[PDB]
Amino acid sequence: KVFGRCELAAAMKRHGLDNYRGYSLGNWVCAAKFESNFNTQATNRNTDGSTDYGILQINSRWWCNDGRTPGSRNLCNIPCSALLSSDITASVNCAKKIVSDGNGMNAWVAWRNRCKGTDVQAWIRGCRL
Numbered sequence: 001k002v003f004g005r006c007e008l009a010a011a012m013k014r015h016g017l018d019n020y021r022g023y024s025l026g027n028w029v030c031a032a033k034f035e036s037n038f039n040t041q042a043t044n045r046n047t048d049g050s051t052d053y054g055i056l057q058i059n060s061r062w063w064c065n066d067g068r069t070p071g072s073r074n075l076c077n078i079p080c081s082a083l084l085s086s087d088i089t090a091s092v093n094c095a096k097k098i099v100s101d102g103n104g105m106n107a108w109v110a111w112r113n114r115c116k117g118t119d120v121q122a123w124i125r126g127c128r129l
Ligand SMILES: [Cl-]
Pocket: 024, 025, 026, 027, 120, 121, 124
């Protein structure tokens, strides 16, 4: 599913990501834009052999099982394929774990490099939320 911007904002808000670990909704929407262009089916191979999955490009080295990431963990207790669903619940549950792991949203390189410190409120402009 390719979410609209406001459509994603509303779903993330409903699932409790606004202010989660102190990160305002626009941070999450910005991260999703640059991670997946709001496409739940997005995937990305990494150089280490892990893969990133879904709306927030959650990685198989620690967070989900894909059966092809040697030595990896599955801290969200999910198949990575679940991160590709049109329903973002699994991605949100897992993102909450990730952002709680110590480095906040820096865990998303795209967020640090493209969203951090920017006008993230612009991401939710116009949305009826
Ligand atoms: Cl915001």
